[PDB]
Enzyme design. Sequence first.
Site, PDB file in Angstrom:
ATOM      1  N   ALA B  58      38.057  53.843  32.954  1.00 54.09           N
ATOM      2  CA  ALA B  58      36.647  53.089  33.228  1.00 54.09           C
ATOM      3  C   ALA B  58      36.657  52.287  32.096  1.00 54.09           C
ATOM      4  CB  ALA B  58      35.706  54.154  33.391  1.00 54.09           C
ATOM      5  N   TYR B  62      33.439  48.571  33.708  1.00 48.82           N
ATOM      6  CA  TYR B  62      33.824  49.301  34.921  1.00 48.82           C
ATOM      7  C   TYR B  62      33.416  50.843  34.467  1.00 48.82           C
ATOM      8  CZ  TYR B  62      36.751  46.248  37.466  1.00 48.82           C
ATOM      9  OH  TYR B  62      37.351  45.211  38.088  1.00 48.82           O
ATOM     10  N   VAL B 145      38.371  53.720  39.762  1.00 48.98           N
ATOM     11  CA  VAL B 145      37.132  54.067  39.323  1.00 48.98           C
ATOM     12  C   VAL B 145      36.090  53.471  40.416  1.00 48.98           C
ATOM     13  CG1 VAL B 145      36.456  52.385  37.619  1.00 48.98           C
ATOM     14  CG2 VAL B 145      35.724  54.997  37.561  1.00 48.98           C
ATOM     15  N   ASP B 146      36.429  52.264  40.905  1.00 50.68           N
ATOM     16  CA  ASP B 146      35.380  51.345  41.679  1.00 50.68           C
ATOM     17  C   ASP B 146      35.228  51.899  43.150  1.00 50.68           C
ATOM     18  OD1 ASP B 146      37.823  50.495  42.097  1.00 50.68           O
ATOM     19  OD2 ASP B 146      37.421  48.644  42.805  1.00 50.68           O
ATOM     20  N   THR B 178      52.830  42.871  51.120  1.00 52.55           N
ATOM     21  CA  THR B 178      52.829  41.943  49.996  1.00 52.55           C
ATOM     22  C   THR B 178      53.632  42.904  48.843  1.00 52.55           C
ATOM     23  OG1 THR B 178      50.800  43.232  49.568  1.00 52.55           O
ATOM     24  CG2 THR B 178      50.850  40.879  50.810  1.00 52.55           C
ATOM     25  N   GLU B 236      50.840  48.134  41.421  1.00 52.75           N
ATOM     26  CA  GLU B 236      51.029  48.716  42.768  1.00 52.75           C
ATOM     27  C   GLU B 236      52.318  48.205  43.579  1.00 52.75           C
ATOM     28  OE1 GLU B 236      48.626  46.513  46.385  1.00 52.75           O
ATOM     29  OE2 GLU B 236      47.592  48.409  45.896  1.00 52.75           O
TER      30      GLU B 236
HETATM   31  O1  LIG Z   1      38.293  46.162  33.029  1.00 50.17           O
HETATM   32  C1  LIG Z   1      38.867  46.942  33.729  1.00 50.17           C
HETATM   33  N1  LIG Z   1      38.439  48.109  33.563  1.00 50.17           N
HETATM   34  C2  LIG Z   1      39.271  49.150  34.491  1.00 50.17           C
HETATM   35  O2  LIG Z   1      38.864  50.170  34.074  1.00 50.17           O
HETATM   36  N2  LIG Z   1      39.978  48.860  35.457  1.00 50.17           N
HETATM   37  C3  LIG Z   1      40.385  49.953  36.075  1.00 50.17           C
HETATM   38  O3  LIG Z   1      41.730  49.446  36.904  1.00 50.17           O
HETATM   39  C4  LIG Z   1      41.290  49.841  38.297  1.00 50.17           C
HETATM   40  C5  LIG Z   1      41.843  48.636  38.949  1.00 50.17           C
HETATM   41  O4  LIG Z   1      41.001  47.349  39.104  1.00 50.17           O
HETATM   42  P1  LIG Z   1      40.405  47.243  40.198  1.00 50.17           P
HETATM   43  O5  LIG Z   1      39.250  45.968  39.959  1.00 50.17           O
HETATM   44  O6  LIG Z   1      39.600  48.151  40.873  1.00 50.17           O
HETATM   45  O7  LIG Z   1      41.187  46.346  41.270  1.00 50.17           O
HETATM   46  P2  LIG Z   1      41.688  46.463  42.622  1.00 50.17           P
HETATM   47  O8  LIG Z   1      42.240  45.196  43.305  1.00 50.17           O
HETATM   48  O9  LIG Z   1      40.855  47.487  43.493  1.00 50.17           O
HETATM   49  O10 LIG Z   1      43.059  47.280  42.250  1.00 50.17           O
HETATM   50  C6  LIG Z   1      44.057  47.561  43.133  1.00 50.17           C
HETATM   51  O11 LIG Z   1      45.232  46.732  42.642  1.00 50.17           O
HETATM   52  C7  LIG Z   1      45.560  47.104  41.445  1.00 50.17           C
HETATM   53  C8  LIG Z   1      46.790  45.767  41.158  1.00 50.17           C
HETATM   54  O12 LIG Z   1      47.379  46.062  40.026  1.00 50.17           O
HETATM   55  C9  LIG Z   1      46.062  48.232  41.145  1.00 50.17           C
HETATM   56  O13 LIG Z   1      47.187  49.014  41.760  1.00 50.17           O
HETATM   57  C10 LIG Z   1      44.721  49.183  41.697  1.00 50.17           C
HETATM   58  O14 LIG Z   1      45.269  50.713  41.562  1.00 50.17           O
HETATM   59  C11 LIG Z   1      44.604  48.878  42.945  1.00 50.17           C
HETATM   60  O15 LIG Z   1      43.650  49.741  43.457  1.00 50.17           O
HETATM   61  C12 LIG Z   1      39.961  49.972  38.325  1.00 50.17           C
HETATM   62  O16 LIG Z   1      39.206  50.711  39.407  1.00 50.17           O
HETATM   63  C13 LIG Z   1      39.550  50.565  36.976  1.00 50.17           C
HETATM   64  O17 LIG Z   1      39.765  51.967  37.133  1.00 50.17           O
HETATM   65  C14 LIG Z   1      40.184  47.775  35.705  1.00 50.17           C
HETATM   66  C15 LIG Z   1      39.687  46.667  34.988  1.00 50.17           C
HETATM   67  C16 LIG Z   1      40.317  44.976  35.284  1.00 50.17           C
HETATM   68  C17 LIG Z   1      40.737  44.417  34.164  1.00 50.17           C
HETATM   69  C18 LIG Z   1      41.081  42.989  34.386  1.00 50.17           C
HETATM   70  C19 LIG Z   1      40.955  42.513  35.970  1.00 50.17           C
HETATM   71  C20 LIG Z   1      40.382  43.138  36.682  1.00 50.17           C
HETATM   72  C21 LIG Z   1      40.147  44.622  36.458  1.00 50.17           C
HETATM   73 MN   LIG Z   2      39.998  49.279  42.856  1.00 51.47          MN
END
Ligand SMILES: O=c1[nH]c(=O)n([C@@H]2O[C@H](COP(=O)(O)OP(=O)(O)O[C@H]3O[C@H](CO)[C@H](O)[C@H](O)[C@H]3O)[C@@H](O)[C@H]2O)cc1-c1ccccc1
Ligand SMILES: [Mn+2]
EC number: 2.4.1.40
Lengths: 278, 278
Positions: B58, B62, B145-146, B178, B236
Site C-alpha cells: 500500500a 493506496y 490492496v484495492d 492477454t 501478471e
Molecule cells: O501507487 C501504487 N501503490 C500501490 O500500493 N500499488 C499496489 O499494487 C497493486 C496493483 O495496482 P492496481 O492499481 O490495483 O492495478 P490492477 O490493474 O488492479 O492490477 C493488476 O495488474 C497488475 C499488472 O501489473 C498486477 O498484476 C496486479 O496484481 C493486478 O491485480 C495495488 O492494489 C496496490 O497493492 C500500486 C500502485 C500503482 C502505481 C502506479 C500505477 C498504478 C498503481
Molecule cells: Mn488491484
Amino acid sequence: SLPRMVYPQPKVLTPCRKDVLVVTPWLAPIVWEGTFNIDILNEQFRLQNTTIGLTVFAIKKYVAFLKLFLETAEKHFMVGHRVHYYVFTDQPAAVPRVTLGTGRQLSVLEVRAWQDVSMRRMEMISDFCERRFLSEVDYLVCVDVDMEFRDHVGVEILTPLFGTLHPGFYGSSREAFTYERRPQSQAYIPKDEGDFYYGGAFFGGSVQEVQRLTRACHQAMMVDQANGIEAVWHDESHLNKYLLRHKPTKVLSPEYLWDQQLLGWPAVLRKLRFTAVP
Amino acid sequence: SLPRMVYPQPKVLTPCRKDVLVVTPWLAPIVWEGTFNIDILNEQFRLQNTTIGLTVFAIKKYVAFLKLFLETAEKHFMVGHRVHYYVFTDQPAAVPRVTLGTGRQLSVLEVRAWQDVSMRRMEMISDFCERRFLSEVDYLVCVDVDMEFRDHVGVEILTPLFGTLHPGFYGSSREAFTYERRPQSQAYIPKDEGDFYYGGAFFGGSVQEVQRLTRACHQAMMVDQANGIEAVWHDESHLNKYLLRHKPTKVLSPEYLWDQQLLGWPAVLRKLRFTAVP
Ligand SMILES: O=c1[nH]c(=O)n([C@@H]2O[C@H](COP(=O)(O)OP(=O)(O)O[C@H]3O[C@H](CO)[C@H](O)[C@H](O)[C@H]3O)[C@@H](O)[C@H]2O)cc1-c1ccccc1
Ligand SMILES: [Mn+2]
Ligand SMILES: O=c1[nH]c(=O)n([C@@H]2O[C@H](COP(=O)(O)OP(=O)(O)O[C@H]3O[C@H](CO)[C@H](O)[C@H](O)[C@H]3O)[C@@H](O)[C@H]2O)cc1-c1ccccc1
Ligand SMILES: [Mn+2]
C-alpha cells in the site's frame, strides 16, 4: 519446469465428467477417465525421475496368478517410468520368468506360508521391508495378485496417500458399507461416519505415507488380536478406519479396482483398468 | 488423525457442481463453493497449527484502501487460524489502527515510494523478506490492496502453489488471453499454449513455493528490463508464464478474485469472496 506442450485448452465452464463426483469434500481428486491429461502428468513425474514400487503377495496356490498379473503389468502399469516389483512368495522357484521393459526390475522376497496372511501383508510392508523401500522407490502401490491389468494404470494415481473405491459400494449409502461395526474393535466405524468404502486390493502413496498407514493398520490389528476380536473384513476394515481418520490425497474410481464377471461394464466406467481374474 | 466428525456423505454418483470444471487436467482441484466441506479442511489445518502470512502493498495513495481491506480480512480471511499480515508501505503512520482477533498479528514493513512497483513486489517477497517468512509462516498469500473480503476465504485455498482465475477471462479461449505475445520477452506464451489466465491480484502457496515463484518472476523481469522490453501486464504476465510451466496444485475460481461493478454477480458465482473496491 515443464517443456512447451500443445494440448486442448481446459474449459472452466465445461465439466469433464457430469455423471460422477470428481473431487472429494477435502479437495482430493477422484480419478476417472476424462479428468486427467496423461501427457502433462507423465512429464511432471518423469522430470522427477519417479520410481514406483509395486508389492504383491503370492503365497500357496496364488502363485498361479503371477504370470498374468506380471505380463499385464508390463503392458499397462506405469509404462515409461521406473518400476520395481516386489513379489512376496513362499515359492520363489514358482515365480514365472516374465520379460521386463527397460527401467523395470523384479525382486523375489521369500516369506513363510487368512487372518494371519492379512496381518502379515501389513507387517511385511511396515516393518520388514521398511528401510529397503525408503532407499529404492518413491511411491509404493500394494495390490492383490488375483487380478490383471486391462488398461492404463499410470502416474495419475500417484500422490502422498491414495485409496480406491471398492467396486461393490461406490453407489451405496454409508450405512450399507461393511465397515467393522463392533466398538470393541480398533477398526470400529459408527453408522453415521464414513466417506467411502475403500477396497483392500489397491492402495498406495509415498513410501513414508504407506509405511505410516501399514504400521497403524498392523498395530490396530495386533490390539484386536490381543483383545480376542478379528475385524469383519480383516485388513480392509482397518484400511477403512485409517483412511476415514487420515484422508487420502487422491481417491481412485472403481476403474482401478473392478470385477467384470460380478459387475459387468456399466456406462459410468469408461475404462476397466485393473480387474479380478474370474 | 482427525477426530470423529458427523457430516453429509459424499455421493460418488452425484457431482457437487455440474455447471463448472472442478478439477484441472493435472488433477489440481478448482475451488468453487459446493466442492469443499470446510469443517474437514479446518480440522486438517488446525491440527498442524497452520500460520498463514498475508502480504499486501500500500504505497502512496493506496494506503487509503487499507482500512476496509484489513477490517474485512478480520471478518473473512482464515478466521480461527493463525494469521500474520505483512503490510508494505512508504507511510507507516498512515496504516490504520485495526483491532485484530486472537492469534493474528500485523507487521508494518516500510519501503521506498508502476513497472518499478511491479518489480518491487516480486523482489520484496523473494529476496528481502525471504528469511523472515520462512521462520514465521507456513503459507503465504500475496494480494492487491484495492480489494475487500465479502465472504469466507479460508484454508480451502492452501496448497503448495495456487493461482486464481482472472475474472475477465475464465470463459475465454486461450487465444483471447492477454498473455505476453512477443517472443523477445521472457513472459512470452505462444497462441497455442495456455491453460488459464491467472490474476496477478491473488496468488500464494507454501513459503518455499511462493519464494520460488517470485524469485523466478523477478529474475525474468530483470532479464526483460536489460533487454529493453516490459511485459504487457507486467508481473501478471510473468506470473502466467510461471504457472504455465509450473502447474499450480490448486486453482481458485473467480469467487476469489472478482469485480462486481464490472462483472455483476453471475449465476455461476455462488459466493463473491474477495472483490475489487469500486
Ligand atoms: O501507487 C501504487 N501503490 C500501490 O500500493 N500499488 C499496489 O499494487 C497493486 C496493483 O495496482 P492496481 O492499481 O490495483 O492495478 P490492477 O490493474 O488492479 O492490477 C493488476 O495488474 C497488475 C499488472 O501489473 C498486477 O498484476 C496486479 O496484481 C493486478 O491485480 C495495488 O492494489 C496496490 O497493492 C500500486 C500502485 C500503482 C502505481 C502506479 C500505477 C498504478 C498503481
Ligand atoms: Mn488491484
Ligand atoms: O493363500 C493366499 N495366498 C495369497 O497370496 N493371498 C494374497 O492375499 C490376497 C487377498 O486374498 P483374496 O483371495 O484375493 O481375497 P479377496 O476377497 O479378493 O480380498 C479382499 O479382502 C481381503 C480381506 O481381508 C483383503 O483386504 C484383500 O486385499 C481384498 O482385496 C490375494 O490376492 C493374494 O495376493 C491370499 C491367500 C488366502 C489365504 C487364506 C484364505 C484366502 C486367501
Ligand atoms: Mn483378491
